[PDB]
């Protein structure tokens, strides 16, 4: 029995609904979790939630600082997001300086790994790139490969693929695997001829990351060069919107669909392993409808960010509770962040584990073309970050 | 016709005197400019200066933000510094958001060049690394060179040398000159062999930037490879530390001095073209006096940072004055900042010109050994950024 609590949380995400983690898309997930917690917290407890546009940029820092300056120093008890890499860094640094706990289903980059100082109050609830980099290391040791070409698009802006493959590069480095690096701006004028030439010039195994379309083009030029007959083993990373297989990620209703289908026979796509549960089903629907009667169409199964933010709420609540029960308050930010680490709980989609560094363990799947004639793609193997073992599907 | 104006100023530089632009080394120069100014503006007009430690990092942002949040939501009137690249970006962004004028003798990186949005309220009073790049370009056209090797140390922290050669890269790339890139962390064990061999592989002209001792070492190994004496042209950048660009740069009162001396016959050092005047003499005297009275073993004199901050203040007044005329206040940062751009004024050492983009034009000199026997190093040529002309000496 304790006095009701009033929790102020600042949600910093992009208002623009083109990103998979926009406020419009995540909010439903947050409200679902919030409703499901009340009946761990003293009865009568309530949550004050402020939704602020991050613009996937400097605005995250801009509104956080302005809100605190207006409140004459008053700070939120919990900050959710940003997701975008360059937007989360400054927010994470202030949250730490202020002892405010910060959870995000983004901030996937390597740099956030170091939480001894600068990023101590940051808990990543979605699987970081470095984790995806450990999976690839397992995939590689399993095929006994020891060299790889890293081909990726670099925005010089958001730089998602740069950060994605940095996660692989960081792991391969420590381990000893050799790596060739090659980048291009997929936005600027594309030159698929130089791409493929560098490829064949360096390593026989290629790990790529760029838009699904851009990869398709690279695979066509590769095919048109005879690199798909089985002389190269291509890989691409689509951790958040890998649902094209089932119909054919090569299929574009394009006049190149035939080429593509054949080209993709030497291509494998790494994505997140998504597990289901009855709860997930109902949660998916509501979130889907809320979004629908809002103006946005949503992929059947909600994405990792939306799911991740639901679990962030639960996670925060699970930590605040244990903090309270020990005499401390919601204002002991560091103490709350510590309760969120090295612990396993039940998220909306199933179990969720967060390592001793405050970074979620991620599970991945590998999709490959199982029948070249039809063009059937299927998960041939999965990896389980916590268990640390990769295994092809029986 | 005007009341005693009162300017609240925030200076953010490092407390640590390890830096050439530390609060102790700069504060005197700031104070000097504040006398000849409080002695253009209405009588009584005073400057309240807060000298805060930037720690060449996150501290700059923490202090700026804690200051504005603690005391109401009141922002200082002027911000001087940070100098450090990773420290200035966050302050410049906030300054542009709060419409506060920011002047620095630093923030030299290539990214601060784009002031259409985030860096709109930033005016750099010292030559940016890009100005240095335009200088090499002319140096290159003069000799008909068209390809170079960029060799620099990247500590993955302050990255001064990386940002330095990034300035040469940007200009070379937009112009057409090819460039081999090679980097290492002089913070680790120097494989001064792969370097010298990668060098011997890439190009004939080598642009370098690393600690003074490091360039000395590299230049030795190269010597051991007979790479000096007309075969290759080695350049190293030392824009600020008088100790590193002073005659006899090879000499270290050591065993290598004889060998070292022979390598540098092929080495050319790039630095800033400094000009002085009688008034500059008093300045140097008073500054030295304060610094010495401050127990700091007086370096040798006033560097580009100490000088630049002094001229930053006269530059701020020269703009306040004209903003205070057209009917504006000390709160129209945007307006102030625009009055600092595209203009020439009289600094403590001579004419100072800030270009249309708010960046100080830079003049450089090239230091080469004009007597291998003796070791006599003297300025061979000068480049004047405003005029854009490079010219050897008689």
């Amino acid at each position: 029995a304790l006095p009701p609590q009033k929790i102020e949380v600042l949600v910093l995400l992009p208002q623009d609904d083109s990103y998979l983690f926009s406020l419009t898309r995540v909010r439903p997930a947050i409200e679902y979790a919030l409703r499901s917690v009340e009946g761990l917290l003293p009865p009568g407890t309530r949550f004050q939630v402020a939704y602020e546009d991050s613009d996937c940029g400097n605005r995250a820092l801009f509104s956080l600082v302005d809100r605190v300056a207006a409140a004459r120093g008053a700070k939120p008890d919990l900050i959710l997001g940003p997701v975008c890499e360059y937007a989360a860094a400054p927010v994470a640094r202030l949250a730490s300086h202020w002892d405010l706990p910060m959870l995000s289903a983004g901030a996937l980059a390597a740099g956030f790994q170091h939480k001894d100082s600068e990023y101590s109050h940051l808990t990543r609830v979605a699987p970081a790139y470095a984790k995806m980099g450990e999976m690839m290391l397992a995939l590689f040791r399993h095929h006994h490969w020891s060299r790889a070409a890293l081909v990726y698009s670099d925005d010089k802006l958001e730089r998602n693929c740069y950060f994605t493959l940095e996660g692989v590069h960081e792991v391969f480095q420590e381990e000893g695997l050799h790596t060739s690096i090659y980048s291009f701006d997929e936005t600027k004028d594309l030159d698929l001829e130089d791409i493929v030439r560098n490829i064949q010039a360096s390593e026989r195994v290629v790990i790529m990351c760029a838009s699904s379309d851009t990869i398709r083009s690279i695979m066509l030029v590769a095919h048109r060069h005879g690199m798909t007959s089985g002389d190269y083993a291509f890989f691409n990373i689509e951790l958040f919107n890998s649902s094209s297989y089932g119909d054919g990620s090569w299929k574009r209703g394009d006049k190149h669909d035939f080429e593509a289908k054949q080209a993709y026979s030497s291509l494998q796509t790494v994505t997140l392993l998504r597990t289901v549960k009855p709860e997930f089903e109902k949660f998916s629907m509501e979130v889907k409808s809320s979004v629908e009667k809002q103006g946005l169409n949503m992929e059947d199964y909600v994405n990792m960010f939306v799911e991740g933010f639901h679990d962030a709420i639960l996670l925060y609540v699970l930590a605040l509770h244990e903090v309270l029960r020990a005499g401390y308050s919601k204002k002991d930010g560091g103490k709350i962040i510590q309760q969120t680490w090295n612990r396993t709980f039940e998220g909306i989609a199933g179990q969720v584990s967060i390592d001793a560094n405050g970074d979620r363990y991620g599970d991945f799947s590998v999709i490959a073309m199982t029948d070249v004639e039809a063009g059937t793609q299927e998960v041939i193997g999965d990896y389980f970050g916590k268990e640390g073992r990769f295994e092809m599907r029986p | 016709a005007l009341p005693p104006q009162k300017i609240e100023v925030l200076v953010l530089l490092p407390q640590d005197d390890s830096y050439l632009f530390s609060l102790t080394r700069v504060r005197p120069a700031i104070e000097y400019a504040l006398r000849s100014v409080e002695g253009l503006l209405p009588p009584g007009t005073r400057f309240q200066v807060a000298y805060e430690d930037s720690d060449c990092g996150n501290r700059a942002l923490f202090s700026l933000v804690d200051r504005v949040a603690a005391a109401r939501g009141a922002k200082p009137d002027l911000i001087l510094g940070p100098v450090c690249e990773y420290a200035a970006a966050p302050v410049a962004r906030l300054a542009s958001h709060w419409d506060l004028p920011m002047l620095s003798a630093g923030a030299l990186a290539a990214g601060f060049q784009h002031k259409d949005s985030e860096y709109s309220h930033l005016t750099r009073v010292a030559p940016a690394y890009a100005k240095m790049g335009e200088m090499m370009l002319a140096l290159f056209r003069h000799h008909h060179w068209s390809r170079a090797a960029l060799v620099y140390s990247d500590d993955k922290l302050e990255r001064n040398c990386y940002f330095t050669l990034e300035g040469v890269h940007e200009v070379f790339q937009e112009e057409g000159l090819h460039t081999s890139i090679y980097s290492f962390d002089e913070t680790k064990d120097l494989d001064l062999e792969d370097i010298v061999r990668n060098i011997q592989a890439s190009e004939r002209v080598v642009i370098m930037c690393a600690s003074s001792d490091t360039i000395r070492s590299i230049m030795l190994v190269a010597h051991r490879h007979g790479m000096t004496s007309g075969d290759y042209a080695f350049f190293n950048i030392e824009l600020f530390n008088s100790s590193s660009y002073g005659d006899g740069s090879w000499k270290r009162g050591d065993k290598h001095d004889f060998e070292a001396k022979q390598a540098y016959s092929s080495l050319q050092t790039v630095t800033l073209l400094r000009t002085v005047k009688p008034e500059f003499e008093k300045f140097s005297m008073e500054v030295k006096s304060s610094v010495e009275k401050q127990g700091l073993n007086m370096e040798d004199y006033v560097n580009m940072f100490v000088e630049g901050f002094h001229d930053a203040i006269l530059l701020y007044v020269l703009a306040l004055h004209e903003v205070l005329r057209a009917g504006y206040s000390k709160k129209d940062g945007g307006k102030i900042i625009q009055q600092t751009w595209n203009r020439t004024f009289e600094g403590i050492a001579g004419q100072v010109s800030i270009d249309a983009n708010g960046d100080r034009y830079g003049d450089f000199s090239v230091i080469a050994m004009t007597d291998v026997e003796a070791g006599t190093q003297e300025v061979i040529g000068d480049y004047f950024g405003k005029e854009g002309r490079f010219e050897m000496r008689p």
Partner: peptide, 21 residues
């Protein structure tokens, strides 16, 4: 390689030029 030993300063600005050994 265009990554170097690290990149520590991720989320800073530094996105205008590679590296490599």
């Amino acid at each position: 390689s265009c990554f170097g030993g690290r990149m520590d300063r991720i989320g800073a600005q530094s996105g205008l030029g590679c590296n490599s050994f």
